[PDB]
Design a protein around this nucleic acid. Structure first.
Length: 91
RNA sequence: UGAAGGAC
């Protein structure tokens, strides 16, 4: 998606970010959108390969919704396993 | 996170 082969804003940018912690080592930015889609129209995510990452939606209200209904609930990844996530406000 | 995105 609109690559540049160099450092910079990855692909979808944001406005209303929230952390996603407790994530399995299987997680990635690609799978975070494929699941927070429940909370709303997530458009960007980022991952730190260490059990933490971030995600954002087209509307800031869908974000606080993702850390009140999609916090402390199941999440899934391409590796074939699942774990809870502890969404946070941002950091 | 050696530098970005659909990676599988």
């Amino acid at each position: 998606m609109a690559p540049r082969g160099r450092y910079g804003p990855p692909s979808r940018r944001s406005e209303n970010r929230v952390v996603v912690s407790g994530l399995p080592p299987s997680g990635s930015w690609q799978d975070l959108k494929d699941h927070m889609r429940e909370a709303g129209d997530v458009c960007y995510a980022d991952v730190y390969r260490d059990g933490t990452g971030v995600v954002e939606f087209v509307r800031k209200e869908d974000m606080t919704y993702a850390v009140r209904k999609l916090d402390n609930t199941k999440f899934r990844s391409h590796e074939g396993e699942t774990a809870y996530i502890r969404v946070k406000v941002d950091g």
